[PDB]
Amino acid sequence: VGKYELGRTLGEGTFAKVKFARNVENGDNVAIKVIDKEKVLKNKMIAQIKREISTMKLIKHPNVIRMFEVMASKTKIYFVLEFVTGGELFDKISSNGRLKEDEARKYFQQLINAVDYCHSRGVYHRDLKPENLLLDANGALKVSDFGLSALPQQVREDGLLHTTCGTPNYVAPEVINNKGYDGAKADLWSCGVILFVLMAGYLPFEDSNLTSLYKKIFKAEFTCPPWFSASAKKLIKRILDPNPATRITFAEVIENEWFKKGYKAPKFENADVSLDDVDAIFDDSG
Amino acid sequence: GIHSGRTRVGKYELGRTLGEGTFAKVKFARNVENGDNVAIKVIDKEKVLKNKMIAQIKREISTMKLIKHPNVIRMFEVMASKTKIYFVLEFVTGGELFDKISSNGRLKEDEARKYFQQLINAVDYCHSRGVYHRDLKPENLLLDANGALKVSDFGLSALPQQVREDGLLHTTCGTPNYVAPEVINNKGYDGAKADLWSCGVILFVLMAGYLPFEDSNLTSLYKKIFKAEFTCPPWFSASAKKLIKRILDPNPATRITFAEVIENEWFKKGYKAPKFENVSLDDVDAIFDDSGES
Numbered sequence: 055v056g057k058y059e060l061g062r063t064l065g066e067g068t069f070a071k072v073k074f075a076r077n078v079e080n081g082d083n084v085a086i087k088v089i090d091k092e093k094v095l096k097n098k099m100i101a102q103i104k105r106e107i108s109t110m111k112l113i114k115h116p117n118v119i120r121m122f123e124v125m126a127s128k129t130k131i132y133f134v135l136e137f138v139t140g141g142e143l144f145d146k147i148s149s150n151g152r153l154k155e156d157e158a159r160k161y162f163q164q165l166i167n168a169v170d171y172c173h174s175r176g177v178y179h180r181d182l183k184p185e186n187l188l189l190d191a192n193g194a195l196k197v198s199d200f201g202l203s204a205l206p207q208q209v210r211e212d213g214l215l216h217t218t219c220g221t222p223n224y225v226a227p228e229v230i231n232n233k234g235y236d237g238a239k240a241d242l243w244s245c246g247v248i249l250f251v252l253m254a255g256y257l258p259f260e261d262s263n264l265t266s267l268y269k270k271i272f273k274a275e276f277t278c279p280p281w282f283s284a285s286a287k288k289l290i291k292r293i294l295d296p297n298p299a300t301r302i303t304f305a306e307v308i309e310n311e312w313f314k315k316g317y318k319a320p321k322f323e324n325a326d327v328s329l330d331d332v333d334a335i336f337d338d339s340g
Numbered sequence: 341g342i343h344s345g346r347t348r349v350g351k352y353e354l355g356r357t358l359g360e361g362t363f364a365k366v367k368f369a370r371n372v373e374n375g376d377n378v379a380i381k382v383i384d385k386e387k388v389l390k391n392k393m394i395a396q397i398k399r400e401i402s403t404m405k406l407i408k409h410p411n412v413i414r415m416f417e418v419m420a421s422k423t424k425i426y427f428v429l430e431f432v433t434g435g436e437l438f439d440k441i442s443s444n445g446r447l448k449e450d451e452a453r454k455y456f457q458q459l460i461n462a463v464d465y466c467h468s469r470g471v472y473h474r475d476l477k478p479e480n481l482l483l484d485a486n487g488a489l490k491v492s493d494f495g496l497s498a499l500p501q502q503v504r505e506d507g508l509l510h511t512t513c514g515t516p517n518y519v520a521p522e523v524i525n526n527k528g529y530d531g532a533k534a535d536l537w538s539c540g541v542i543l544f545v546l547m548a549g550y551l552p553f554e555d556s557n558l559t560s561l562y563k564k565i566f567k568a569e570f571t572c573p574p575w576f577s578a579s580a581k582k583l584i585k586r587i588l589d590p591n592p593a594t595r596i597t598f599a600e601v602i603e604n605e606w607f608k609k610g611y612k613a614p615k616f617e618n619v620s621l622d623d624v625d626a627i628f629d630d631s632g633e634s
């Protein structure tokens with residue numbers, strides 16, 4: 055299909071499937087997702103779906119996985135996604151334990167900047183897990199599934215393995231308990247847990263008793279290990295505020311004492327330019 | 341030979357810390373007699389002992405210390421100072437079994453059935469000596485160089501999650517996707533049926549390339565599990581489908597048993613039971629007693 059030469063099938067689900075591919079014009083590893091078109095169009099959120107996908111198509115951030123192309127047929131939608139080869143960020147933990155504070159703060163800086171930027175373009179992840187933190191060959195963080203995470207659950211089951219150690223930890227209490235919730239505050243909770251794990255080497259909420267586990271999460275009862283600095287612990291407790299109404303904002307995190315150390319904000323540009331054929335994103339075109 | 345600038349417990353010389361949790365650590369170590377490399381888990385003794393399940397913990401760790409199964413991570417020795425317990429465990433270097441799936445997708449029916457056979461034999465073997473895993477997950481399915489499955493954390497999984505946490509994101513996960521609904525419901529009395537369900541989910545992943553129950557929405561995830569709501573991909577043979585539905589039965593009472601799985605026609609294909617010699621020495625009660633070593 056088009057610019058892309060197909061490789062093996064990575065995953066094959068009921069309403070979606072994923073194939074390996076390369077760009078015959080530049081040599082880039084990509085993946086291509088193919089999903090049932092009417093499954094998306096039927097969905098109640100379609101107007102938001104179209105808007106977020108349209109936006110992500112345009113977004114170029116050095117720490118966000120590129121969505122190169124969105125194409126449709128009469129029955130399918132095709133997403134072409136950047137494929138990186140550095141593996142998962144959490145691989146570093148499984149093999150050498152906790153990261154040093156300065157290395158954890160760096161990846162956190164890249165994550166907070168990428169997430170914040172997507173938010174400022176009106177795109178919220180809402181399902182941020184360690185498996186979305188990828189690395190490129192040069193060890194730069196690449197966050198996946200912005201925009202795609204908006205898709206209905208049945209096309210999110212694309213035949214690939216999605217497994218997370220300690221799933222409930224990454225889900226904010228309001229997302230666990232309520233139908234609706236603030237996207238930015240939910241993503242920030244996930245980011246906060248991700249930082250805890252990077253710096254501690256283990257999850258902040260552990261308990262074999264599920265009732266005790268979820269009680270802990272709803273009161274944000276957890277303990278920072280003794281090697282966390284005073285300033286790192288203060289930031290993590292404001293981020294892992296169980297009330298989304300009082301939880302710190304992204305702007306306040308970016309202005310925080312600890313976060314600013316060694317923080318040189320990334321310099322990049324994008325236009326590309328914005329969204330004037332939005333409702334036709336999934337329109338058939340050979 | 342020995343290194344004067346390193347600590348030393350028994351014939352083992354301790355090297356550096358791989359992972360650190362609140363109460364447990366994992367260190368590299370070396371058998372100074374024959375040069376074997378091992379991992380040693382070190383845990384606060386008092387924290388282990390102050391637990392109403394300490395009796396079960398001593399039995400399972402005593403059993404595990406004696407079992408030699410080709411598909412189980414070996415526990416060579418257990419030693420104790422006055423304030424620490426040292427669990428001496430074997431290494432593997434073949435990574436995690438779900439690496440194959442994660443980077444390269446599902447496996448063919450023959451090779452997934454092979455891996456399933458190893459899992460089932462290892463788990464059935466441990467069960468029949470009275471050890472139940474109860475936390476089977478991908479982080480416990482390791483491979484060696486021969487690409488043979490080695491199940492980790494038998495015995496150790498009897499320790500409380502927060503005590504055995506070693507800061508490596510392996511031993512303590514608490515991921516509902518692999519947990520039987522009666523366990524989730526705090527009614528998982530039958531340890532063997534609960535382990536079988538996790539084995540069924542693991543098989544499904546090998547043959548499908550993905551989890552049978554999954555959802556970004558936690559409410560929906562738990563509902564799928566309780567109802568055992570899933571579907572097999574169309575490339576599953578009829579018998580495989582039939583076996584997987586018998587395992588992923590949300591009622592443990594009618595769920596198929598381990599013995600029935602072992603005599604199952606689909607399971608039996610290419611199946612070669614592990615030939616190996618099989619005791620009970622000596623003092624279960626003393627498993628954590630001060631060994632009297634540096």
Ligand SMILES: C[C@H](CCC(=O)NCCC[N+](C)(C)CCCS(=O)(=O)[O-])[C@H]1CC[C@H]2[C@@H]3[C@H](O)C[C@@H]4C[C@H](O)CC[C@]4(C)[C@H]3C[C@H](O)[C@]12C
Nearest residue numbers: 085135136137138141142145148198199435436439442443
């Ligand atoms: C899971 C793999 C990572 C490969 C890997 O595995 N690399 C490390 C090797 C080391 N091993 C694991 C072998 C040993 C470590 C043992 S351990 O088990 O501890 O890991 C990563 C690398 C590239 C990723 C895809 C692309 O972005 C495109 C696309 C973006 C969407 O948004 C989501 C879907 C999709 C298809 C992505 C899915 C997935 O996310 C991929 C396949």
Ligand SMILES: C[C@H](CCC(=O)NCCC[N+](C)(C)CCCS(=O)(=O)[O-])[C@H]1CC[C@H]2[C@@H]3[C@H](O)C[C@@H]4C[C@H](O)CC[C@]4(C)[C@H]3C[C@H](O)[C@]12C
Nearest residue numbers: 229230231232233234264265268524525557558559560562
């Ligand atoms: C906190 C939530 C609240 C329920 C809920 O669902 N709250 C509204 C959310 C709406 N949704 C997010 C579903 C969106 C719907 C959009 S829709 O498109 O569907 O319209 C509920 C739902 C499922 C509950 C757990 C399970 O019981 C399993 C388990 C039973 C044991 O005893 C121990 C306790 C435990 C861990 C429970 C904890 C907790 O109590 C959970 C997470």
Ligand SMILES: C[C@H](CCC(=O)NCCC[N+](C)(C)CCCS(=O)(=O)[O-])[C@H]1CC[C@H]2[C@@H]3[C@H](O)C[C@@H]4C[C@H](O)CC[C@]4(C)[C@H]3C[C@H](O)[C@]12C
Nearest residue numbers: 148149366379413429430431432433434435492493494510
């Ligand atoms: C995860 C790390 C190793 C990281 C690693 O080695 N990562 C794979 C990279 C290399 N690869 C395999 C990808 C190359 C393949 C090339 S190929 O071309 O073949 O694909 C491994 C190495 C040693 C392992 C521990 C010991 O067991 C002791 C102990 C046993 C008990 O029961 C409880 C668990 C515990 C703590 C174990 C946990 C974990 O399991 C450890 C830390």
